[PDB]
Write an enzyme that holds these catalytic residues in place. Structure first.
Site, PDB file in Angstrom:
ATOM      1  N   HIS B 142      26.563  -9.935 -11.066  1.00 34.82           N
ATOM      2  CA  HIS B 142      26.207 -11.303 -10.747  1.00 34.82           C
ATOM      3  C   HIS B 142      24.706 -11.495 -10.587  1.00 34.82           C
ATOM      4  O   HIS B 142      24.064 -12.227 -11.345  1.00 34.82           O
ATOM      5  CB  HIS B 142      26.893 -11.709  -9.454  1.00 34.82           C
ATOM      6  CG  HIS B 142      26.810 -13.176  -9.150  1.00 34.82           C
ATOM      7  ND1 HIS B 142      27.533 -14.124  -9.841  1.00 34.82           N
ATOM      8  CD2 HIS B 142      26.120 -13.852  -8.198  1.00 34.82           C
ATOM      9  CE1 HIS B 142      27.284 -15.320  -9.337  1.00 34.82           C
ATOM     10  NE2 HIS B 142      26.431 -15.182  -8.338  1.00 34.82           N
ATOM     11  N   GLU B 143      24.145 -10.841  -9.578  1.00 32.99           N
ATOM     12  CA  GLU B 143      22.732 -10.999  -9.276  1.00 32.99           C
ATOM     13  C   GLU B 143      21.855 -10.550 -10.433  1.00 32.99           C
ATOM     14  O   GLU B 143      20.663 -10.828 -10.451  1.00 32.99           O
ATOM     15  CB  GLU B 143      22.369 -10.257  -7.993  1.00 32.99           C
ATOM     16  CG  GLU B 143      23.181 -10.690  -6.770  1.00 32.99           C
ATOM     17  CD  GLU B 143      22.933 -12.131  -6.352  1.00 32.99           C
ATOM     18  OE1 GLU B 143      21.991 -12.773  -6.867  1.00 32.99           O
ATOM     19  OE2 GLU B 143      23.685 -12.629  -5.494  1.00 32.99           O
ATOM     20  N   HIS B 152      25.722 -20.556 -11.927  1.00 35.40           N
ATOM     21  CA  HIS B 152      27.052 -20.784 -11.396  1.00 35.40           C
ATOM     22  C   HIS B 152      27.912 -21.556 -12.366  1.00 35.40           C
ATOM     23  O   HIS B 152      27.510 -22.603 -12.877  1.00 35.40           O
ATOM     24  CB  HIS B 152      26.960 -21.590 -10.106  1.00 35.40           C
ATOM     25  CG  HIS B 152      26.873 -20.749  -8.879  1.00 35.40           C
ATOM     26  ND1 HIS B 152      26.025 -19.669  -8.780  1.00 35.40           N
ATOM     27  CD2 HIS B 152      27.524 -20.832  -7.696  1.00 35.40           C
ATOM     28  CE1 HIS B 152      26.165 -19.113  -7.589  1.00 35.40           C
ATOM     29  NE2 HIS B 152      27.068 -19.800  -6.912  1.00 35.40           N
ATOM     30  N   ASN B 215      31.240   4.863 -23.317  1.00 39.43           N
ATOM     31  CA  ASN B 215      30.573   3.881 -22.474  1.00 39.43           C
ATOM     32  C   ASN B 215      29.581   3.058 -23.294  1.00 39.43           C
ATOM     33  O   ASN B 215      28.946   2.139 -22.783  1.00 39.43           O
ATOM     34  CB  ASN B 215      29.924   4.541 -21.245  1.00 39.43           C
ATOM     35  CG  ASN B 215      28.787   5.485 -21.603  1.00 39.43           C
ATOM     36  OD1 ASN B 215      28.619   6.546 -20.993  1.00 39.43           O
ATOM     37  ND2 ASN B 215      27.986   5.093 -22.579  1.00 39.43           N
ATOM     38  N   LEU B 217      26.830   4.106 -24.681  1.00 38.51           N
ATOM     39  CA  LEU B 217      25.469   4.561 -24.439  1.00 38.51           C
ATOM     40  C   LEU B 217      25.302   6.013 -24.888  1.00 38.51           C
ATOM     41  O   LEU B 217      25.858   6.930 -24.279  1.00 38.51           O
ATOM     42  CB  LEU B 217      25.133   4.431 -22.948  1.00 38.51           C
ATOM     43  CG  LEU B 217      24.257   3.271 -22.477  1.00 38.51           C
ATOM     44  CD1 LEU B 217      24.225   2.152 -23.487  1.00 38.51           C
ATOM     45  CD2 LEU B 217      24.730   2.762 -21.134  1.00 38.51           C
ATOM     46  N   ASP B 276      -0.238  -0.933 -37.598  1.00 40.11           N
ATOM     47  CA  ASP B 276       1.010  -0.203 -37.387  1.00 40.11           C
ATOM     48  C   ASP B 276       1.446   0.525 -38.669  1.00 40.11           C
ATOM     49  O   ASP B 276       2.029  -0.087 -39.559  1.00 40.11           O
ATOM     50  CB  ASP B 276       2.101  -1.172 -36.925  1.00 40.11           C
ATOM     51  CG  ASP B 276       3.278  -0.472 -36.271  1.00 40.11           C
ATOM     52  OD1 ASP B 276       4.391  -1.034 -36.299  1.00 40.11           O
ATOM     53  OD2 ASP B 276       3.102   0.632 -35.723  1.00 40.11           O
ATOM     54  N   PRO B 277       1.150   1.834 -38.769  1.00 40.32           N
ATOM     55  CA  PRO B 277       1.494   2.650 -39.943  1.00 40.32           C
ATOM     56  C   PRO B 277       2.997   2.810 -40.144  1.00 40.32           C
ATOM     57  O   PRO B 277       3.520   3.909 -39.969  1.00 40.32           O
ATOM     58  CB  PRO B 277       0.880   4.014 -39.616  1.00 40.32           C
ATOM     59  CG  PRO B 277      -0.165   3.735 -38.609  1.00 40.32           C
ATOM     60  CD  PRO B 277       0.353   2.593 -37.794  1.00 40.32           C
ATOM     61  N   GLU B 279       5.765   4.016 -40.720  1.00 43.57           N
ATOM     62  CA  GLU B 279       6.648   5.151 -40.442  1.00 43.57           C
ATOM     63  C   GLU B 279       7.928   5.022 -41.255  1.00 43.57           C
ATOM     64  O   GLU B 279       8.629   4.017 -41.168  1.00 43.57           O
ATOM     65  CB  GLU B 279       7.032   5.261 -38.967  1.00 43.57           C
ATOM     66  CG  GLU B 279       5.978   4.899 -37.969  1.00 43.57           C
ATOM     67  CD  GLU B 279       6.607   4.375 -36.697  1.00 43.57           C
ATOM     68  OE1 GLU B 279       6.369   3.206 -36.338  1.00 43.57           O
ATOM     69  OE2 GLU B 279       7.380   5.128 -36.072  1.00 43.57           O
TER      70      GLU B 279
HETATM   71  C1  LIG Z   1      24.231 -19.280   1.930  1.00 41.62           C
HETATM   72  C2  LIG Z   1      25.411 -18.515   1.309  1.00 41.62           C
HETATM   73  C3  LIG Z   1      26.760 -19.128   1.740  1.00 41.62           C
HETATM   74  C4  LIG Z   1      25.271 -18.337  -0.234  1.00 41.62           C
HETATM   75  C5  LIG Z   1      26.241 -17.277  -0.876  1.00 41.62           C
HETATM   76  N1  LIG Z   1      27.056 -16.517   0.120  1.00 41.62           N
HETATM   77  C6  LIG Z   1      28.281 -15.908  -0.238  1.00 41.62           C
HETATM   78  O1  LIG Z   1      28.565 -15.946  -1.448  1.00 41.62           O
HETATM   79  C7  LIG Z   1      29.236 -15.179   0.728  1.00 41.62           C
HETATM   80  C8  LIG Z   1      29.052 -14.915   2.084  1.00 41.62           C
HETATM   81  C9  LIG Z   1      30.209 -14.210   2.572  1.00 41.62           C
HETATM   82  C10 LIG Z   1      31.036 -14.071   1.488  1.00 41.62           C
HETATM   83  O2  LIG Z   1      30.471 -14.653   0.367  1.00 41.62           O
HETATM   84  C11 LIG Z   1      25.488 -16.310  -1.789  1.00 41.62           C
HETATM   85  O3  LIG Z   1      24.353 -15.964  -1.584  1.00 41.62           O
HETATM   86  N2  LIG Z   1      26.192 -15.864  -2.818  1.00 41.62           N
HETATM   87  C12 LIG Z   1      25.571 -15.083  -3.868  1.00 41.62           C
HETATM   88  C13 LIG Z   1      26.585 -14.115  -4.474  1.00 41.62           C
HETATM   89  C14 LIG Z   1      27.680 -14.777  -5.263  1.00 41.62           C
HETATM   90  C15 LIG Z   1      28.045 -16.090  -5.220  1.00 41.62           C
HETATM   91  N3  LIG Z   1      29.096 -16.317  -6.069  1.00 41.62           N
HETATM   92  C16 LIG Z   1      29.440 -15.136  -6.675  1.00 41.62           C
HETATM   93  C17 LIG Z   1      30.442 -14.862  -7.610  1.00 41.62           C
HETATM   94  C18 LIG Z   1      30.565 -13.574  -8.047  1.00 41.62           C
HETATM   95  C19 LIG Z   1      29.717 -12.563  -7.582  1.00 41.62           C
HETATM   96  C20 LIG Z   1      28.718 -12.834  -6.657  1.00 41.62           C
HETATM   97  C21 LIG Z   1      28.572 -14.145  -6.189  1.00 41.62           C
HETATM   98  C22 LIG Z   1      24.975 -15.987  -4.950  1.00 41.62           C
HETATM   99  O4  LIG Z   1      24.136 -15.527  -5.715  1.00 41.62           O
HETATM  100  O5  LIG Z   1      25.290 -17.175  -5.093  1.00 41.62           O
HETATM  101 CA   LIG Z   2       3.957   2.644 -37.281  1.00 37.12          CA
HETATM  102 CA   LIG Z   3      28.037   7.719 -23.470  1.00 37.48          CA
HETATM  103 ZN   LIG Z   4      24.828 -16.675  -7.536  1.00 37.98          ZN
END
Ligand SMILES: CC(C)C[C@H](NC(=O)c1ccco1)C(=O)N[C@@H](Cc1c[nH]c2ccccc12)C(=O)O
Ligand SMILES: [Ca+2]
Ligand SMILES: [Ca+2]
Ligand SMILES: [Zn+2]
Ligand SMILES: CC(C)C[C@H](NC(=O)c1ccco1)C(=O)N[C@@H](Cc1c[nH]c2ccccc12)C(=O)O
Ligand SMILES: *[C@@H]1O[C@H](CO)[C@@H](O)[C@H](O)[C@H]1NC(C)=O
Ligand SMILES: [Ca+2]
Ligand SMILES: [Ca+2]
Ligand SMILES: [Ca+2]
Ligand SMILES: [Ca+2]
Ligand SMILES: [Zn+2]
Lengths: 416, 412
Positions: B142-143, B152, B215, B217, B276-277, B279
């Site tokens: 996600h992040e 979202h 995997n 990779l 860039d030679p 290769e």
């Molecule tokens: C301020 C707060 C409520 C924002 C959310 N918090 C939560 O998601 C939370 C807290 C306890 C249980 O969940 C936040 O920062 N969320 C994050 C992570 C997120 C949000 N939706 C998904 C779906 C799938 C994976 C991760 C996340 C966000 O980046 O929004």
């Molecule tokens: Ca080259």
């Molecule tokens: Ca592999």
């Molecule tokens: Zn998010």
């Protein structure tokens, strides 16, 4: 509401005093030629998937309404200013050229804003009466218009065949009618990437002032249909050569014309924009999508988040969204005070050069401010400025600056 | 040979909270980090993306930043650490801080939007929300998707009857699926704002986690790898033995025509310029050579420029890129607004702060180009957007004089 591949430049030709005396006052003869230039200019632009339609001719047989100066840069900013303050306010049109006898300094025989098509001021071009040959003058006309379409000269390996191309570095004695590969790309880049919405509509026959002409691919007076030459006509509703409809067809033009018959009534023919855009639907008895109707400009729209404006509902909220994407909203009023500084970004209305500051009330009508919460980059008063278009990120004319008030030209003027 | 995929070279940093929680069992944490990284690669496949763990740092002694419960602080702190420390001693595309200390506004993850490859911003932070690998993995996916300009799932983006990776909020039983919007946004951000740092393919030795078969990779001990036998489409390698089937020769790298070698002269790498030679291969070469360039400073293009990292930057070519045709190099006199010190006119940056150019380094800050557009004549036009103050600066390595050149804001 089928998609038209073509655009249409509703041209407006102006003819200078100089030019008139050249022609011994013969107004009818001038008109006659300006009618012919137009048809050659439309002939020429067909390669570019564009048309040229003469929606106005104004001969200064009285006297030049601007000073036409030998130096061609003054004269152009001058014609561009008159085009905007006087001509535009009297007549709708997309693009205006100025034909002239006046000898320019260069020598230059044509001069025109780059990528300006549709700009209230800059959609213009000066054109020298560089020859009696209409093929020549028309080539110049089409050339400058091309510059407005944001086409630059051919260079290097640009080709239009073994002929002299329109945007060639410089004009030939025996000129051709051919834009070049390089031109077609550059022109459609300009459309795709600057979108001059103003060249989108097909001009109505009544709208056009040149003797109607069959086969120019412009529906006009007396014509039941037009679809170019017999050799080019894809309209099986139309006898290309006589411009009259075929046997059973009740129509051969318009959005409300199916197979060859009229569109069922209730048949949507112009999709709604927003809630200030009542849709249009076919009559069942005509061939054309009925005129376009908006709501009352200034009407509470979007649960009173905004006041209407030309069919759309400009709310600060969406404006942010476009600039800055999802999850970004309208900022604290305090942010708008930066508009009074009168600097590169903070102002209200640039008048014709300088950046005029904001009135402390008019501050909600300049550069926009949004409350960006982009993690690790939180910024209360987020603003947007590129000198690639200082307009990107100014409040849209039509936006609520308060209750019962909208932004008209830099000002948070009153609603009614 | 054009490669569809991009390759996130991930570096995980584990905090103290975490460590105490595992009573300091490092050999363990390592093992789980390897798992997480694998799960996170599965997930990503859909975006035609890969995550390869090329680094892992357990803060089992000190804590290298004071991770506050203000996620925004911790985040900017951890980003500065990444770039002013971590990135100095380790090449890597993206980094993540797994913490066991609770953040404020109940936050499990926090990431920069569209930050992929940014020296400082290519990072995110993930919370030890759960013992469940797949739960943690998904936060990481996600992040990261955040890192990648992915948003979202609005109100009706879908991925079956499963909870999706970029859902408003996480479920009690997550799944490995990214939504259709996500595919779109991902590559839009990739198409639009292409991050170069995720194009190269990780060397098998560039990866620190125990090699895995299937995997997608290439790694150590593998001849080839093309994912599950179900997804392996090149008929050159048994996708479970990873050592090529009956009489196969090779199976990866550009120089392998369906299960066999290339040949000599066969051009193998792009050639940005004359600096860039190319290769080529040789046969006997199962892959391509290393990218030879040209000893920087070797005169190039009609003696208008001197090489750099493979290209040949000249003022002119740099005006055309910003402003289109008919816009050429401005006279030296414009470049003088680079000692003005203002929003557009500096020579570099020290600490957020802008340094005016010395009269000497002037053609080495903001770029200036001659633009004669009729009606809009500007002799010294330059480019400036608050989207990226750096857009328009003269390019690091550009000829500013006979023999002299630009580097970190000087003509030298
Ligand atoms: C301020 C707060 C409520 C924002 C959310 N918090 C939560 O998601 C939370 C807290 C306890 C249980 O969940 C936040 O920062 N969320 C994050 C992570 C997120 C949000 N939706 C998904 C779906 C799938 C994976 C991760 C996340 C966000 O980046 O929004
Ligand atoms: Ca080259
Ligand atoms: Ca592999
Ligand atoms: Zn998010
Ligand atoms: C600076 C100046 C020399 C540019 C020219 N002047 C002339 O080309 C000229 C005058 C007498 C004989 O040649 C200019 O006016 N350029 C214009 C017109 C132009 C340029 N290329 C073509 C090709 C076809 C038709 C017209 C033109 C321009 O629009 O750039
Ligand atoms: C234009 O067309 C010709 C085809 O004869 C080609 O040689 C030339 O390089 C093309 N260039 C562009 C920019 O389209
Ligand atoms: Ca029009
Ligand atoms: Ca006609
Ligand atoms: Ca309507
Ligand atoms: Ca990489
Ligand atoms: Zn020209």
């Amino acid at each position: 509401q089928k998609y038209n591949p073509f655009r249409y430049v509703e041209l407006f030709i102006v003819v200078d005093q100089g030019m008139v005396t050249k022609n011994n006052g013969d107004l009818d003869k001038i008109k006659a030629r300006m009618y012919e230039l137009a048809n050659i200019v439309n002939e020429i632009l067909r390669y570019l998937y564009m048309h040229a339609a003469l929606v106005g001719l104004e001969i200064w047989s009285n006297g030049d309404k601007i000073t036409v100066k030998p130096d061609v840069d003054y004269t152009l900013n001058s014609f561009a200013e008159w085009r905007k303050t006087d001509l535009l306010t009297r007549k709708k049109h997309d693009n205006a050229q100025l034909l002239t006898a006046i000898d320019f300094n260069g020598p230059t025989i044509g001069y025109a804003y780059i990528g300006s098509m549709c700009h209230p001021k800059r959609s213009v071009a000066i054109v020298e009466d560089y020859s009696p040959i209409n093929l020549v003058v028309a080539v110049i006309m089409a050339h400058e218009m091309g510059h407005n379409l944001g086409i630059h000269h051919d260079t290097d390996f640009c080709s239009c065949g073994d002929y002299p191309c329109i945007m060639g570095p410089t004009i030939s004695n025996e000129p051709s009618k051919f834009f070049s590969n390089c031109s077609y790309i550059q022109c459609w880049d300009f459309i795709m990437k600057e979108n001059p919405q103003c060249i989108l509509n097909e001009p109505l026959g009544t709208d056009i002032v040149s003797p109607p002409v069959c086969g120019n691919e412009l529906l006009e007076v007396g014509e039941e249909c037009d679809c170019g030459t017999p050799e080019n006509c894809q309209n099986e509703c139309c006898d290309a050569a006589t411009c009259k409809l075929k046997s059973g067809s009740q129509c051969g033009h318009g959005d409300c014309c199916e197979q060859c018959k009229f569109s069922k009534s209730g048949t949507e023919c112009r999709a709604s924009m927003s809630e200030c855009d009542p849709a249009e639907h076919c009559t069942g008895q005509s061939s054309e999508c009925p005129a376009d109707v908006f709501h009352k400009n200034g009407q509470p729209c979007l649960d009173n988040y905004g006041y209407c404006y030309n069919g759309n509902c400009p709310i600060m909220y969406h404006q942010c969204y476009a600039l800055f994407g999802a999850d970004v909203y309208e900022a604290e009023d305090s942010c708008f005070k930066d508009n009074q500084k009168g600097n590169y970004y903070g102002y209200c209305r640039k008048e014709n050069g300088k950046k005029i500051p904001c009135a402390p009330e008019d501050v909600k009508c300049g550069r926009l401010y949004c409350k960006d919460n982009s993690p690790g980059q939180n910024n209360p008063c987020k603003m947007f400025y590129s000198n690639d278009d200082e307009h990107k990120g100014m409040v849209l004319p039509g936006t609520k600056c308060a209750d019962g008030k909208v932004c008209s030209n830099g000002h948070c003027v009153d609603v009614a």
